[PDB]
Design a protein around this ligand. Sequence first.
Ligand SMILES: Nc1nc2c(ncn2[C@@H]2O[C@H](COP(=O)(O)OP(=O)(O)OP(=O)(O)O)[C@@H](O)[C@H]2O)c(=O)[nH]1
Ligand SMILES: Nc1nc2c(ncn2[C@@H]2O[C@H](COP(=O)(O)OP(=O)(O)O)[C@@H](O)[C@H]2O)c(=O)[nH]1
Ligand SMILES: Nc1nc2c(ncn2[C@@H]2O[C@H](COP(=O)(O)OP(=O)(O)O)[C@@H](O)[C@H]2O)c(=O)[nH]1
Lengths: 44, 430, 431, 431, 101
Amino acid sequence: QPQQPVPLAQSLGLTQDEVAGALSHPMVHELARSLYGKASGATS
Amino acid sequence: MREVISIHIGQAGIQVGNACWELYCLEHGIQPDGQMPDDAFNTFFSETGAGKHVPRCIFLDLEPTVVDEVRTGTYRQLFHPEQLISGKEDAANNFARGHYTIGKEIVDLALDRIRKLADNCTGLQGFLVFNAVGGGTGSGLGSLLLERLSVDYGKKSKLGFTVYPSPQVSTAVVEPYNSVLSTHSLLEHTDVAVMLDNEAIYDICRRSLDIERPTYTNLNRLIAQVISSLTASLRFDGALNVDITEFQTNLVPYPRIHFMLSSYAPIISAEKAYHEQLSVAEITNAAFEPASMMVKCDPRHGKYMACCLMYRGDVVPKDVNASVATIKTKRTIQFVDWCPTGFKCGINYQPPTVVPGGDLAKVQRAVCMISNSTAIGEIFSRLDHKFDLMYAKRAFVHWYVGEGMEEGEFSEAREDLAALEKDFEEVGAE
Amino acid sequence: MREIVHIQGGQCGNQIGAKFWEVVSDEHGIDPTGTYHGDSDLQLERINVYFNEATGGRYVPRAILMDLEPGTMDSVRSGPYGQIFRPDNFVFGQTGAGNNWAKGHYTEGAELIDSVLDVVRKEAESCDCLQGFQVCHSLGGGTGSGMGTLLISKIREEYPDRMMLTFSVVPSPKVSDTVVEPYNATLSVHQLVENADECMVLDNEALYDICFRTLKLTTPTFGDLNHLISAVMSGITCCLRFPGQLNADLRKLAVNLIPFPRLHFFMVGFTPLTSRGSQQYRALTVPELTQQMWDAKNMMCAADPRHGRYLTASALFRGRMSTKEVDEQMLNVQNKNSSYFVEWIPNNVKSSVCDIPPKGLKMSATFIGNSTAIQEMFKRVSEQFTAMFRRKAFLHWYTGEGMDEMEFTEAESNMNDLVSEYQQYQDASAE
Amino acid sequence: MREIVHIQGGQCGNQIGAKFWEVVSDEHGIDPTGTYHGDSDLQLERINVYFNEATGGRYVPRAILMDLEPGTMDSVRSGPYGQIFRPDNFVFGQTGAGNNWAKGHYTEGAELIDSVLDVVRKEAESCDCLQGFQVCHSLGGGTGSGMGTLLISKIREEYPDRMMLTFSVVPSPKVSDTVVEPYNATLSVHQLVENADECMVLDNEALYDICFRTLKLTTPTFGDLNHLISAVMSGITCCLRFPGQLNADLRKLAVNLIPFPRLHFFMVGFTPLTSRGSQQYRALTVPELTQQMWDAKNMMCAADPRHGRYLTASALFRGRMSTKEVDEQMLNVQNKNSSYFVEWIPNNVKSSVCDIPPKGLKMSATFIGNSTAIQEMFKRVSEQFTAMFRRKAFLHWYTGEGMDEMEFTEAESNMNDLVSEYQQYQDASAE
Amino acid sequence: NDLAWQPFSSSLATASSDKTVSVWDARAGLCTQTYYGHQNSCNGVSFNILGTQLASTDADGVVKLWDTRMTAEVATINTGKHPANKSCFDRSGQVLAVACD
Ligand SMILES: Nc1nc2c(ncn2[C@@H]2O[C@H](COP(=O)(O)OP(=O)(O)OP(=O)(O)O)[C@@H](O)[C@H]2O)c(=O)[nH]1
Ligand SMILES: Nc1nc2c(ncn2[C@@H]2O[C@H](COP(=O)(O)OP(=O)(O)O)[C@@H](O)[C@H]2O)c(=O)[nH]1
Ligand SMILES: Nc1nc2c(ncn2[C@@H]2O[C@H](COP(=O)(O)OP(=O)(O)O)[C@@H](O)[C@H]2O)c(=O)[nH]1
């Protein structure tokens, strides 16, 4: 990590409901299912 | 006017019906609540005075769990509660249990609801029976239902999207038994039977979608896309419209020979999408590739008899003609000597809609190739020895006998499958 | 909506059943006072399989406790979940069976069997639909083995079509607890062969081996063995209680497991059993679950599968997993170990998948194997029974209870014939 | 994605393996807790060659730690990287072999070899693709030599095509530690000739030489020798783990090194090993690395290459370097020292280049030389073995473990045949 | 109640009091065929000398002759109400001798 000579949640205006239900969203569930389906190639 | 009644029997039938009906809702804009914010939906949905649309489908199963999953999930305000029919005791992988003892009252109620559904249809293109050959519910109850439908409705075209056991991989042990029984049953009732194999669709997902852990949801989504492509010509206008009745005329040469390999193209993830041109010729070639077949059955072993191609999206007749000419000039693709044309091309102007949450990419073109070819006898050949190997010892036969079957039923089913093998050999031979 | 009637017999059976009910209540979020505290819809979705709703929010097990001495079920009420059971389902005698199968089956078991059947019928009729009965007990004890086999016979008479499942703790090979274990086991096996549709064989020494080698426990009490048995008994029926991607009920398991009616004895195991130190050192994957599942050390039966041949094997997986991954794992296991699998069955695996893993475990898998290896266990029990019967030691205690000597030899003949059938299908060749 | 199964055997083998795993974890940026803390993508790119992922981010070696006494791996666990290893991979007995190869191969090794093979098979089956096994151990010790040779034979039987690499600490020429070193070495070399595909020969006295003459250390403990052995063990396989301008796997090295199957014994050395004083002063260049590696003093083998002839020699360089510079340097070495190189091979050098130098070093290069010089080492070991075997000293300890006297004679004959082949290819003339 | 080997064969026909006459394979141990024609306990069975037909008696006096390969009832005859006990085929003949109470 280079030297640099504020929170991500604060950025983009993410609401507390979105933060709480981030992993509970059906779209995120589908994303997790796809990531699990592509084992070791998920990060490709 | 172009109504088609959908039947989903057993766990596999209901689980592919979930994908099919989600796809239809996405395609026609119908929200899961039941209503959408013309008359292209009439094939699959019947509209009420309130404007809310109910599918013309029937979820039949002897087990409550799968149907209750639908009753509890998102599509609880869409389906008809009585159309969801739930049994009390499962068939326990017993064809006799699903065909002789438990299936009676359930099939009576099923015929009742099917009459009620067909009474609401001006026209009726046919029935789409989605079951699982290899399970007591799907095989036995499905066979009984198909027999009853053949007896009462008569000449209505029943298209059976059956899933036979894979060559090597499987989940059941008595699967050869009940598969042979159900194949005996459905050789004489269904009009066009579409073969599907879990191993082949797993291979398709692993190779084309790059899914190292394919699952039943992915398999059902692929099957749903294929059935949507099959029915697209009923709901959306386009050049070279193809009909349910035209499937049989252009695909079934003789009444016994009506089993069909199905292949969809392209099957590409969005990361691999827009990285190839995806032209009509290339998608036709992919559809004719043996790996793209959804049945573990190499077409190189046999010879093609007929091929119905269903093109979706931005497809032009010049391109379908050029691709089919290249296919005819191709040497590995081999046709029977008695069918010089052997092709039924049909285009549709509606591109395949992409399911959010799916792996398929948004592609402007698609091909669904459904082919009658004599190679399909190979899968019956595999089950014919998988059956007799267990039948020599009469293993698990007491289970089937206990629910009111006889050794004669097994003998007759084996003999009829042997006759089907012989018929496939004879049609393949000159 | 497919109900199961749980029955506990004998001291060992009662303790195992109490631990099983504790585990099931933990899985469904049921406190010992009966109130639901799970905060999950799926826990209450199929609670009626095991429990019934009381006047209030209380949930009561569909359990029937059987014994001839009241001390064991006094301990049952003193147990952590001793209050969930209805007091009317405790059926007890006054003089316990002195490890005497004859006493528990003919003399003292005859009187109490009236109340046992009355309670069983009362619980069965209230059920909408009945999958069947599951009876947990120990072979090699008076009240448990004898009285339980008597109940099993009566229930088979009453409900021939309903499923019968038995969890029998067969006497262990090396270290035997009571002297008359071979006699009681020989007599109970004869009843289980004729009556029980589905039977699981468990051994205390196999449980000790697994809890000392895999779990790496130093001082495992009977509570831990009951814990492992309870895990298996929950996992066998999790498909009824929870949604599954490929579900399979008890009757489906029996159909896919039993080739012939007399070959219905099964050896079971549970995964993932991980030592506490290596819990961070195990990566929870379907191949790892299969590797532990097919290991002979994980089997809770004394007989090791390597000696025999797998006639059939069911694997009920639980958790978020790929059907392709599971199916490929089992096919690959069969292909690698084709020597240990019977040739005249093309596929020897019944794979089922459930979407609800046990609490805390991301994935799990219970294994139910029908293999010819259990032949050697029945052979050892025969080697003990014949040795004792030749000199007729302790035979007078069974004789004084009104049991004819011919009954012992009939039971031995039945068990030897079962051994012969297992050998026949171990060495049967295709075509 | 070409995995390697590491095995450590005996006291010396276990300690060398611990140091090697410390070095590899440092290179891949793995802290003793297993979490990656390296901050370089290429480190994690091919971490699967040695490590597997746990439930968390933990990375654990694919190592199997073998012994008959527990204190050695108690020390291993107490070491700085003791808790990275999977606790299930520690296979140890209760009583160690008293420097008795017979005890480690026949009596006490027989029982534990089943568990060892189970652990090895479990580690191999989890691998996607298996390059092979590497066994680090010491000839001239009871458990080390015995269990190592037995396990190598078993692994050769199970996986014949998979590569086998051995790091054998041959007993030192001048100063021997234990009396029965000649016996153990003679019995182990016979097994290694037949089974081990690729073998590195190491000497404690040769390492002591390099640490006094190149490294100029004062009182170097065994940790330093293990550190240098670990450097060689890492550098031999760094091409698998890191991208290379001209990469070369273990099979490529073996193919280019072994002219005939029995001539698979190799001497190895590492560069640049320099003292602290002249570190600022020494020029870090490809010619300097070549000059150092081709020195006899750089060898970790006691035998000096000047007496023998180089049959083959591989050099694996690490660092952003000129392939022309490397090739020209090694061609120049051949042309200058053509008397030390075999005539009937036009090119006796296999050059491999990797783009990632080891941490701290601007450059590096590991050398693996197949030369007939090791003939004198085997000759000396035979000279000691024959001296003891003529009077049958200490022979009764081995004979009491149930091995024939004939095995000693067969091992000596095989070892002498290997020496004869080395002499034949030293003095072979072209055409 | 009765047992008889099929002539010069490994098949064994056994008649039981369950009103059933079952033909088994001795080597395999499985029931090749079963006949449910009887309405009472089947006292006896007899084979034709060639094995073509099987005569099974009944407690009520019914004697049923079954065909081996057709697996069907060729001839159901009734004696008096008394039980038929055991029967015997004539040596290469078309006659069946039955006992009676
Ligand atoms: N392609 C595909 N096949 C499935 C799917 N789900 C189940 N199957 C197949 O369906 C077969 C059994 O289905 P069912 O008969 O309906 O199972 P069930 O509902 O419990 O009914 P029974 O098993 O007969 O008691 C299995 O062999 C599977 O191969 C699915 O989602 N996709
Ligand atoms: N796993 C387990 N086994 C037990 C327990 N209690 C007793 N046993 C075993 O069960 C065997 C039979 O005893 P049991 O059937 O309970 O005696 P009974 O109640 O008089 O019939 C004995 O050999 C004990 O080793 C227990 O809590 N758990
Ligand atoms: N380089 C190195 N050599 C060692 C070490 N420990 C022991 N040795 C040498 O290895 C030789 C064999 O010992 P070893 O095989 O480990 O004894 P064993 O394990 O009981 O069989 C001894 O003569 C030692 O000189 C070590 O940590 N490093």
